[PDB]
Amino acid sequence: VHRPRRLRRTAALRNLVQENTLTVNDLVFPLFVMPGTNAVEEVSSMPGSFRFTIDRAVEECKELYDLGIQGIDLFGIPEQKTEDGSEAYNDNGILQQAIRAIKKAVPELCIMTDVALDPFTPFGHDGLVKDGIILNDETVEVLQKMAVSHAEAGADFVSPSDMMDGRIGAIREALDETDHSDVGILSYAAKYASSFYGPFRDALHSAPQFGDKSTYQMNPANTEEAMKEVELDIVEGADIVMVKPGLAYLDIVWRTKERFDVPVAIYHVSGEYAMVKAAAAKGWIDEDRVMMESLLCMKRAGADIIFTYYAKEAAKKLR
Amino acid sequence: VHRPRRLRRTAALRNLVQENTLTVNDLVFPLFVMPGTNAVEEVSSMPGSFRFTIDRAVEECKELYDLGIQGIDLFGIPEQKTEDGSEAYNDNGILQQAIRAIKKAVPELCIMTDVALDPFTPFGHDGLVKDGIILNDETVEVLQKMAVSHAEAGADFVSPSDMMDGRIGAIREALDETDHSDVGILSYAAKYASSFYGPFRDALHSAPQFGDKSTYQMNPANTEEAMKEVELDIVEGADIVMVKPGLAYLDIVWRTKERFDVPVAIYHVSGEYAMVKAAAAKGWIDEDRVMMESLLCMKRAGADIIFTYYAKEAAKKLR
Amino acid sequence: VHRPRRLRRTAALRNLVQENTLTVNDLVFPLFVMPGTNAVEEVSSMPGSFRFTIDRAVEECKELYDLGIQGIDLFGIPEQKTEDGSEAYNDNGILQQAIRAIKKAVPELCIMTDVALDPFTPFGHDGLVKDGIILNDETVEVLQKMAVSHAEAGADFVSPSDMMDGRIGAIREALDETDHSDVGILSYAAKYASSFYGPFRDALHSAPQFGDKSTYQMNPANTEEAMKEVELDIVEGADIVMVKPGLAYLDIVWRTKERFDVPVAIYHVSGEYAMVKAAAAKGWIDEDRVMMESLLCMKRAGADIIFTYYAKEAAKKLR
Amino acid sequence: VHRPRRLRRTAALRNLVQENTLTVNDLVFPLFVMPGTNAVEEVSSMPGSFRFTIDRAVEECKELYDLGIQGIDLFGIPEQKTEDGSEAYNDNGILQQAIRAIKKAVPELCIMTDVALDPFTPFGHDGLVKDGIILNDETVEVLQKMAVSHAEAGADFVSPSDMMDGRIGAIREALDETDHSDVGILSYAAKYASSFYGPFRDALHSAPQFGDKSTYQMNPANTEEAMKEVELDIVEGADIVMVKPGLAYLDIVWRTKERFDVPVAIYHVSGEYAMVKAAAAKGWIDEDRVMMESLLCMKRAGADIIFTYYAKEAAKKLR
Amino acid sequence: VHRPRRLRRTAALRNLVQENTLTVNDLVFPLFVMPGTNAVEEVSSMPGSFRFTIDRAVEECKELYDLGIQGIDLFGIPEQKTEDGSEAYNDNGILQQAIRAIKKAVPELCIMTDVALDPFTPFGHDGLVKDGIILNDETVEVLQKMAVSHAEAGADFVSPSDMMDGRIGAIREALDETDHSDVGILSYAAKYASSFYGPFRDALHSAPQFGDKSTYQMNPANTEEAMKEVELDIVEGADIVMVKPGLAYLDIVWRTKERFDVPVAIYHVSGEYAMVKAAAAKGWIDEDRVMMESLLCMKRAGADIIFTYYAKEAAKKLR
Amino acid sequence: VHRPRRLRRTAALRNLVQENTLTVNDLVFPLFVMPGTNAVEEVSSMPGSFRFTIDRAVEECKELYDLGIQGIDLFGIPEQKTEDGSEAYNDNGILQQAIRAIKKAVPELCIMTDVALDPFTPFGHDGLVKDGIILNDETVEVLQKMAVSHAEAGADFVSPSDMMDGRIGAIREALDETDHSDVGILSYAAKYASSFYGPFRDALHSAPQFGDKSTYQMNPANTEEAMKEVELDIVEGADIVMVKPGLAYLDIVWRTKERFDVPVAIYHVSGEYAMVKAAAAKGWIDEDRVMMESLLCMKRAGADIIFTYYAKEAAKKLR
Ligand SMILES: *C(CCC(=O)O)CC[C@H](*)CCC(=O)O
Ligand SMILES: *C(CCC(=O)O)CC[C@H](*)CCC(=O)O
Ligand SMILES: *C(CCC(=O)O)CC[C@H](*)CCC(=O)O
Ligand SMILES: *[C@H](CCC(=O)O)CC[C@@H](*)CCC(=O)O
Ligand SMILES: *[C@H](CCC(=O)O)CC[C@@H](*)CCC(=O)O
Ligand SMILES: *[C@H](CCC(=O)O)CC[C@@H](*)CCC(=O)O
């Protein structure tokens, strides 16, 4: 009686019933900005990924937008790393310059900016360290000024990847106070303590991360705790809530979409990206096929936004 | 605290968070075929719609598929109308000739065929009439042969618009018996007794429709009864289920999608089409914008397939 | 075994099981009030619709109530349009006079009043414009005084169609402060950026609307975002929540009714009205049948109140 | 913040927000028919209710339909009572004569017929008795013939009040076999062992009811068991399901409507009717107001059809 | 296969599976206290009901508790009725004396006290009347002092039957402020504007109730609005929430129990009581059977507490 | 108020609250068997994976079970490939020899056997090919015999990976007929048309896979269709249901577990395995940590059984 294969008999039927499709409007391109002029350094552990000087990020953002990419996520690599991480909220900071430069050149592009102290401190942590303890409230107060700093330079969205308690609310208070109630917050609501973050940590040159990040980042075994975490951020006022990492976390994505009535974002992490890249170099997989299939998997799971290092290559195929 | 306008501040942000999108793959173009060679009669009450000869129907389907449309829905206008409606299951019938011709020329296109006795009988009803009563089981037995007839001509899908009880299960049985278990059924599961079908009625020249069709077509006031209708049709083995009419019935479309786990189809009826067309001719509305917005509304309501007479125009804009 | 057609066999059975019915108590008549004495101007793009002088609105409200209509929605057309839109909260305003006059003549009628700056400003926007940006908070403070102004003149309900963030709460604070805790608020909770608003914009003579209204009005593709929008307004204290537009938005209506335990209102928009009117002028549809069927569709979708320009014609048929 | 009294401040507002309404189309009038010509005996325990002769029953039905009542429920009082209850399926039985006479005179009225052995047997039970045991399957086999008998006389619906297991499926089978698959079944799905049926019992003169009917009629303490009872009856093929008694059973009515997607019917029992009637005669209550409020309560509980002895009085007021 | 009658075959099986049972712990006895010494007046419209002088209420409360009744609801009939209703919060009031006397004699009994201005004012309303408008906030401030007055005299629970907005919260604030955070509140959360309250209004001799109570008491047609009403009272801090009236409102009771995780109370109103009493006087029903069946109906619907005038007669049978 | 980091402050607290854990009992080791004696060929595209001879397969299973692995999944590589794939049901086939040998040596281990025609046919598809069409019912009839063949050799479970319609029910029928109603079925219920199966394909040497397998394997874009697929398979009688591929499909795994009440299995595909393996060889990721985290992710998604090529390595670490 029931033969499901009827909806798969032809390409002309599979497209009709196809529940989900990937578009360029689902893609956000992360951009690493280092100091200097006219230099582009390839990440050794992320083939195809690059460190960009401000002038080169500007031109990259032209190519990105012309391909139809709507948003970018900016990551800063400072020349000086300090224990108090005060360079994070420097108005003359490399990140701040990048925002200001890109907003001038490509105004129609949405500039999302990372709000974390990870590459701004010698300990390699998202927050301030005292006696081996990564502090909560002391960090958030630094995070407040950082988000203000980004909004000041002209940023559209701030994306705090710190995983501190109640930072989203404080940042909302901080941004509202400084005439930026129109600058949005993409919370990294359920960021897990993953072993998939390798290639990202050498890409930002962040100094030895010391002890692991299990004091604040989620236990990879937990599902219910992600639901608690996301809700707190929505009550705090987050416009968009993200789950990280991506591929092996598509179950959390589904739970967040089915339950919260808020745009869902996902991170196609460096490790996932390096996995596809290394296996294709050996000839064991097809890079193009796996990268696109995995991006469609994220759309099926219920993600609306995908922060991916394959965004530009994905943009070219969806033209 | 909460400012939803943040996700509306720029075209860049609106596109990232946009929950639903319209594609060429959500469109099916209904096609009316009349007897003769090389003639295209425009429908008076549907500007832009045409009665096609088998040879010019082929011409249209080349143009349709090249624009990226995956499926068509065929309607036949027979030279002769009989009380027993036997021409419906004629193997040399115009409908059958059109299927066989289109399938030869453009094989990669999905041919869906209307299974109803409306234009084949002088009484203008979907079934066989006796003493003013439109008969159920006697009709289905004729419909069984009709559906088999289409499959024999080369049809991919059959779309029974009759609204007789238990027709789908019997058609499934009849199709399975004649080695066509790979031919699908798109059921008009919740088809309503609407006054929006005016322009469709004179388009197929169907003879005096007599009294209304409230004895079998659903009461426009009923919601819970659409759920009952759809289920029976799924248990019977429908691959796709349809809600008709479209615009003013998007609540039913949403109920069907949230409850049944089966591809949902919808009909953008001739009345809706003529309504946009007549108001645009006066300059009171923008044709392109209203037609596209109404199509987006249907995707939002949770439809996957849209039977629309604007399909080709919409395809041109999404190209 | 199961033959649903049994409940459709006769008119005497269809009425018994009929899930929903339209009554006069479901209808609200929108009224446009222009300055002057003894003048009634027909809207060129809305046949059957009229611009009313105060003395003529009074007499119209007699005919409306005598037919059994319980509520009216007042729209003002001022002689002077100012960039600050201060005429909106003028106690001697044409809208205010209308409220005061109608309340004297027909006390038993519920006067709902529009709270938006659309026809009161040269830019044709629901709010105040600065550097091309339609302001949020600055607008709401003007909206506060406007609602107070209406309540002062004797209005029963205020219906803010502005689509600003947090206006409903502020208006509730504003009305509570000025001894009007008994004057209700019908929020336009999920008003979409539609291309169906044409004939309404020329009816209020509102000056060229400049750029589109996508910064605040909802994306026609969004369903989940409407659920977020409605809830915020209910927490803010809205007595009634409306979805706009109507016919092609019946899915949102269903979601709002099934989830919020609050009276649901809907807007039968000018474009929908002009569509039925233009097609009937051509003879392609039956005006009476389509207008009533579409009103029943709204009752089926779960609406309690219908703001419709066919209200009086609908009232006459339901007598 | 929240003031619900805002929607109660005026008759104009109460009517707009009113969730449910009572219509003539929700009313079915039960009619008792006795042997003889031209005689109307008033029931002592039901003031306003009458025993009717076939000829005066016709007279009543003209008056009923002209007031707008769509359906009647017929009860027969036979001249002779036999232990095998064979008069129930007599083709010249008074019930059958009444069906055939009413259907000729007022054809546009829906005739529903009681299928029970209560007034046809000396033991006063719904089924056949053996050794003090009211038999199940032996009863249903008699009920099958009874239902067929009514269909043969011209009945539109059969309403089996017996509360035997699996009776509906068998009646459906029996009706389908005898070319009556178009005749519906209104099942007394959750009929309770109530003490409210006093005035109904002497009205049909049913001989000494013996011991109570707790062996088959539901325990007034059971909720979950009504859900079990109703489902079996729907799977068996009931078109409408009924809850009995009415007023004190509105919770069951709500459970049935929220869970089953099938038209729900209810019985306004003789005891409820006599209760209002006796208290009004003392001047302790207002008859008109209580009868109407109780009918509104049933519509609110989610019933669509109401079997009530006040049907004609209610029809007069809704006219 | 499935024969439900198996669980009804014997009394020894019906008791095992019986889902719900009525106990004495489900019963609360309402008590009307008039001024004077050694006098008991029978309510003409409520046979079996009595007006009690303080000394006679004390002795009645002995008989009530000895039968196993845990709670009583006290209603006051003052010698003087004033427009400001200041006698309501008089420490020397007849109600206050009753509380104090009964608490001395039967300490183990739970004294619940009515908090409404109905029999304390000449207009016969639950609140203070100004220009025909029954005031909200002005009433609640009087209600605050009334509840304090009751708690002062030694009351256990206060049961506000006023149906004013936000009274439960204010009374909670008022009781908390005056060292009575341990005195509970049984809110009349969803009290409907019923025509069943007749015999209660003459029992308290309350002066002509003037215009009806539709400005604050619920529309008998509304279900969703009861859900909104109950929640507000639970957020305000109500320990117990009641639905009124009882029998014809068992659907609201079910909705309240299934959704709110809070003890549910119900009122077996005077009109329901007078209905059973009048019909039994005629011999049409069995008083004992109907009274107990209807009390079990309330337990089935999900009520925990039943305010009933048959409580003592019910207590005697459940001994 | 809320600080989730409290449950992350120490390893002592993280372990107490940890929602999910990985055990040796959640692991199944897939085993490839080739013809010959005493030979172990390592897969070029899967480092760590091996082609085993029946005798060395036994050797492996001793080592596997001693580490605590409860189940294995056997794949056969036949010396000869025929178009009818008859070697699949050969009783002296290598697969059958391996079952019979392993079951003798290590009896306490659960032998699960792959039921597919992929490595047995030159066309490289799961079913029989005719005119470019992979046949359904003709395939299942061969699969029936195959499953019976395994049961005859001594298999405990059969795991059909074919993705033909209605194969499970027929296999259940076929197994029950041949006195093997105690042999289970682990259905590949939602197997997707993935590009992750590269390294598995050359491992079993399966001849040119021809065109893709989108005619029967699920579209990676479909969520609702996995729910439809799984249900049919459960109604057919599957004891365990599987989702494939794994990591990028954890949303489907969660949907299946939350809805179906049947043990959920998952496949850690060769592509995922090669991805971790290739990236670790470059030193971009930690092999041990990523492999274990991905396995934990699967347990979190709600899987109970995990088919993984890292099973033995994982078993060593959990020892
Ligand atoms: C139903 C209508 C048949 C009829 O009444 O003629 C099947 C075809 C639907 C077409 C919709 C339209 O374009 O009106
Ligand atoms: C059930 C009652 C039969 C009986 O016990 O006599 C079927 C008829 C219901 C009538 C309800 C009433 O009016 O009491
Ligand atoms: C499905 C894949 C068959 C094929 O396409 O060769 C059944 C076996 C799954 C193995 C998964 C893997 O390791 O790739
Ligand atoms: C979160 C993780 C920081 C770290 O531990 O390196 C902030 C940035 C996420 C992207 C990581 C990736 O691409 O893997
Ligand atoms: C909302 C839309 C304003 C506009 O854009 O014109 C306020 C009034 C709604 C009615 C519009 C209609 O009737 O189409
Ligand atoms: C609510 C109703 C007051 C009234 O209108 O009389 C407070 C007391 C309820 C009991 C009424 C009854 O027993 O009917």
Ligand SMILES: [Mg+2]
């Ligand atoms: Mg957090």
Ligand SMILES: [Mg+2]
């Ligand atoms: Mg059907």
Ligand SMILES: [Mg+2]
């Ligand atoms: Mg809003």
Ligand SMILES: [Mg+2]
């Ligand atoms: Mg039954």
Ligand SMILES: [Mg+2]
């Ligand atoms: Mg209240």
Ligand SMILES: [Mg+2]
């Ligand atoms: Mg399957």
